[PDB]
Amino acid sequence: TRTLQWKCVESRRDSKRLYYGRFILSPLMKGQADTIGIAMRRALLGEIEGTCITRAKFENIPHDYSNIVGIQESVHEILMNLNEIVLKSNLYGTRNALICVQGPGYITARDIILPPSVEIVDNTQHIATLTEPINLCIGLKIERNRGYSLKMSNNFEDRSYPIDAVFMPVQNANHSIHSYGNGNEKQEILFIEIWTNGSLTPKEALHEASRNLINLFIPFLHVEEETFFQYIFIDQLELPPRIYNCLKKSNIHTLLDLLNNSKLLDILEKK
Amino acid sequence: DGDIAFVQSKSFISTQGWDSEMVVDYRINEDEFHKISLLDCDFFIRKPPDPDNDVYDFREMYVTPPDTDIYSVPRVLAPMPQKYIRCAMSDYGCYDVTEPPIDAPRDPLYKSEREISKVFLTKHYRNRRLNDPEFVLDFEEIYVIDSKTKSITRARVLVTVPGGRKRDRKDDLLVIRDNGNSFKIIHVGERDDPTTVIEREEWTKTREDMEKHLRKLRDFSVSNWF
Amino acid sequence: TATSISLGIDDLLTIPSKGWLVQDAEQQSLILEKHHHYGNVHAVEKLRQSIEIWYATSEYLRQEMNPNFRMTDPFNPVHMMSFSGARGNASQVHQLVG
Amino acid sequence: NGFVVYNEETGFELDKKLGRPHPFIDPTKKKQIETTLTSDESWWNWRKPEKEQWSRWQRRRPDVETVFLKAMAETGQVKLYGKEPTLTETSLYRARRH
């Protein structure tokens, strides 16, 4: 009676970096809801592109120590704060972001000079605290990859400190199945529950996961253009002893073993 | 250089060259002394006036059981300085995270407290202030206040940084080890990763335990390690 | 479910020294039995030795079962089932690997 | 002052330090076992039976560890004390099999 339709039943935004969304898909035949929920969860967790800082270059700072003057936070803690920055972007490849700031004050995500296609989800995120009137320039490395992907190149070693950034824009995902019976009408209802870090709304993550899943199974529909006698043994057939020993050394006992390896043939072909 | 102003007070009573396990009849003014609180004892070191409480006067020192008035004389085991010095005070101990019994409602599930067994007083290089742009810790002169023995000594520090006494102090890295007994100075570029430090200690311990476990086998003498 | 603990034939790890201890017990039992036939020991002395030498061996194998599991195969499926207290005890495992 | 001070082996004691394959007991420090009772200074029940006894435990039990340890020995990944892996080495293999 009904058609397969989806709807958002719950939608909460109790943060600038924590969005919640619950979605319903119905009616579904028996066994389909589990398949959709499993695949969608995999797409949401790793197949969705995420943008975050991967490397940090401390320009004009030859200290190379764990701490620098004028900044309360240690160098390692600054990288930790950078790793928490939530970014949304459509960039292809890699870009460069710069943080050149004044003396005393608070360095926040609002102070990051951004490449054209990227945005700061929450500009209030704290990077570092400045005490002494000293300028600080930071060379960021903005990259956009999937959660499941892995990268090995790390700019070798040129005083650029790598940031082990996790590329998940969907913090968590879960699916639930509700089955309703009417005597013989077994329909299933699929609930999709998505948590995002604000880089994309849960409704958007639902569409991207669906599109990424479809793009995976499109190639299976691709087409390409067109252009215009174990029971007989070598013992029985009369063979020279020289040839017989050579075959026996190579575990060629039957004739099938002989044809599987490639005046021997002249005598053999007649029988 | 950079000697601190050698001022003199009126209540100054020098305790140098006194018996250790004996108490003093009089009572000292705690405002004039640094109060070092440890697990087994409370340690007092004369505090000359200063904008920041960094100047220590080791001429008179007192040790008392924690939160008690009966002062005593610490067991000095090293030639403590006779001049005012600036020492960075950093404690050394363990966290005693315990699960107390629960009888009253809403009693805490855990009780986390820090127990101090030793306190390190690292002299500032040339007695320079913390706010000084040229501040750096002189790791040669470190004093250890042990709670268990209620004694204060000087750290036996091994300097492995190439450069001798003329080296650059900014590259020093004091490595305290063996229950605050082995002090070693190494170059900062040679710092061990904290993961390496933990794994190294675990590998040594388990290797000895594995050998003892395998020692009872009767073919141990004709077996290899790998 | 995710870890999927499961026991196999070789998961039933036996003490490495069981072969030595059993062989040593057999030698003592055989030597004593031979002299019992000679008349150097009487029946009760043979009876006690047979019971005690095999009970001491069995208890020693049970005693050394846990330290062997801990020191060599801590994640042995049979060990984790009993050591964690989930199912079975040392005595029941001893019936399997001792 | 007086509290400030300004500033490897080879073969054994270096393989042992680094964990590289080495004998458990240093061959240069292995004392030769002294002569013992010669079955005439000893009571009965401690003498060798003068004729080896069939035990049913005379063969070492086949193990996964022995096969892999022998396979690793010829590859050079491991260096065993002898041709055949001892029960100590097989037990050690289980601890470090992964």
Partner: peptide
């Protein structure tokens, strides 16, 4: 109880974790 035991059965330590004597990721949350 088995599942919880496996969860809390932490890292391999010492000689069970490294082949040789030494002589890891950081997560912000």
């Amino acid at each position: 109880l088995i599942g919880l035991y496996v969860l809390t059965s932490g890292t391999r330590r010492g000689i069970c974790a490294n082949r040789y004597n030494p002589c890891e990721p950081f997560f912000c949350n």
